[model samples]
Target: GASKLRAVLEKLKLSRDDISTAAGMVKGVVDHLLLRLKCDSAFRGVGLLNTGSYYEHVKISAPNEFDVMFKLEVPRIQLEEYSNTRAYYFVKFKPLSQFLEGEILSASKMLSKFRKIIKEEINDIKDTDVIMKRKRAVTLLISEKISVDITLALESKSSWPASTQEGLRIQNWLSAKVRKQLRLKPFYLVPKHAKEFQEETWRLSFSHIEKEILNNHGKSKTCCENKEEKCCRKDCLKLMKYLLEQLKERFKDKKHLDKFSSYHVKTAFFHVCTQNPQDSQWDRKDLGLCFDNCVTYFLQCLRTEKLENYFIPEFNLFSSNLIDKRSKEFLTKQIEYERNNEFPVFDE
Candidate 1:
């Protein structure tokens, strides 16, 4: 039975060469976009950085999707609270940077201008048919080949807010020194609106820190080392993601389950490891039991309808507005059914 679980994982896991090819493709696409942006007059002060699951090594399945943030640096600006939590803000130029002087740089306007330029330029790309999707970012679907989300963001070198200090509870597991180093890293604010139109409203993005935590995740310095033994932390994450996908398929109503994302599962995994920080808790030999333990942790969060964002404690990742009681009950029942029956969904 353990072998059965391992067998299913092998099929789902990407090969080394496959990962390499995907990386190269993503790099090529990002480089092309950057070059175009550099030449455009409208995007003079813009820069690009690679973020999201592909860079984090957690990407599953086709590997044809990527996310990149095109950042506009603001030397000095005023930030006003746009939401109940400090995570969302309305940016204002105090002295007005030379890059964005003539016109007001609202989040909506910046997103629209960026999307318009991309839609026009993408047509000239050889053998690629690009079309923008209706979403937060300027998403481009490329001829059934690849999909990319080009998000406009504002980069600030300012200090981290006091609100997030109590969050990112990595000290107990990863030491205070490591946590301090991570906090010292620069943070980004992507052009994302919460509800209706708001001027220069942006959401805080900790993708850089997320990547750092996932990469150097072990309590010990030599985790996942060639000489050291391996753990099932990533394995547990992969199984949970697969389980969520299969459950959504079984339900056949994406509209109802839209609130749930892999992020909730990821946050739960982080908490679970912090509670049991030893590598021994996720030994490769005991993967099945460890995975079930993780599932239990995630189910508890869903049942309680409370999963805090790892970086920003004030923002509840699980929103009661979108996810109703019925949906939560259905999700719990499906997961319990899978566990009771040995996860038949993974049976190919």
Candidate 2:
């Protein structure tokens, strides 16, 4: 095949050596971190949930980034949604089997304390160095140039609350049975509230759900299996992500595109898949067309300035408060420019 896009994708592929080396270092550091956290009475019961691009098998370039959540169990509680974004929340409930302390769960308080503990313990780990870039997460720079983003999460056993009304409506995308099963699964509340946004609100995270969705993507059983049939949905998704990454790197100096993220691209991909549900829609041999379709959908999103969160339908990720109109127009021009020129960003 003389396909330029395919050739670029081949170049972007992570070799077995890349995964073996990076994954080994991650397992070593992560195990040591877990042991170090175990020594502390506070984080003794910390649990790990591995997610993000690498886990989703769409990683491009070096496998140097990781998203791991160190979660603690929480009893039943009522969730309160932030009136502002409706994506963030405050976990309001009585504290751990106590008499009467307070009614609110202080996410910021716990996050800060946990952050300090990690900073201290990271000192004991041989190859790990703490980067104290705590916003909703802490960064640990490993010896092999790998950086792990550690998030503090509260895992609750309570029923999915009414507060999650306008979110995770993937009924049309996946089967109702699968949707119900996922809804019954545990959800994480991470400390991602802005500084000025008080009350220590936590943001709901669904990275694991995304992993599962990508894992069993096709409508038919055994869709991407080694046998019967396959679709290039994931391959198309990777091209879109790679395109965005290349553009970001190229326009690194341009402030107009600072707010754009790969998450937004993936959200658009999921929506596109839902709209074109059949396996034939994403033909295995239609690499160029599939990728072009993905680009068109993303361009449409930028043009309209209406990239809604796939999980949280009501939450507009491209809203004016989040991204100005100028940014959208600039990104639209850049994408259309690349599209018109045969995605020069992907090829050399």
Candidate 3:
């Protein structure tokens, strides 16, 4: 059984040359686009921050999909609070067609403006085109193949907004010093409304932090780098994501399965890392057991309909509004089927 797991991990390896090509082309286009956007007055002080699995180095298979978040550090503002939790922005800035005559910044307005800029500037790129728009992320098709998602985000230079006091409960996993430093770092506010027509509730992000913790995913600083100190943490995560992707493809007709993205798998992995922080627990020698443990956590979350956001424990990553009870039960049952049957979907 362990050999089976190792076999699949080996099969899932990405092509080194393929990754180099994708990264270079994508980076060139993104940097050039940001330069042009900066010149256009409206996007002044905007900086680049790469988020998601690709930057996190947990991306499986081809590197066709990318996530790049553009950050604009706002001077000062207050977040309108609701129920002592999720905060929506109450902007008092005077700016472009990006905002109304009031003290609220609408995602609809800013996103529309950014979309226009992409359409215009994309023509300037050599082999790229604005290809698709769905959900909160937009895509750019490069070489008529690769797609990079561009997200516009707002960054505030301050402490963790009180909503996430219960989050980063990592004192047991890492030191209190680590927790303090992570909370001090600026977090990007996702450019999509958390609910209703309210100016997108601050869907907080600690993307670079996620990348940091995942790579340095050891109690000791010299973890995974030294002999006899190997860890399967990231490998386990990649396997979970690969399993999730296969389910996504096979059950395409079961439309709701799309709700279970690789992010859910990644979020689950973060919780697992915290739950079992010691490198000794995730020895790379037992890669199969480590990956199965991650899957067990994923299944438990699905069955209970509860997957907390790793950074903001107050936020539910598996809430009903995002995916209904029917979908949850549907996915839970199917995943269990695959696990019990030895995962025929991973066949070569």
Off by over 4 Å in 1: 14-23, 95-105, 127-136, 196-200
- lDDT of predicted model 3: 0.76
Q: Compute the lDDT of residue 162 as modeled in candidate 3.
A: 76
Give the winner by TM-score: 1 or 2: 2
Off-target runs (Cα >4 Å) in candidate 2 are 14-16, 94-102, 127-136, 163-166, 194-196, 226-228
Name the top lDDT candidate: 3
Worst window of 10 by summed lDDT in candidate 1 = 95-104
lDDT of 2 at 43: 69
lDDT of 3 by residue, 234-347 (tens): 888888888888888888986979778887988898898888877888998877778788889998998887998887776777888778989888888877888788878788
The Cα local distance difference test for each model comes to 0.74, 0.75, 0.76
Each prediction's RMSD over C-alphas, in Å, is 2.9, 2.8, 2.4
Per-residue lDDT of 157 in model 1: 76
TM-scores of all candidate predictions against the true structure: 0.89, 0.90, 0.91
Better lDDT candidate (2, 3): 3
How far in Å is the alpha carbon of 193 misplaced in model 2? 1.3
Best by TM-score: 3
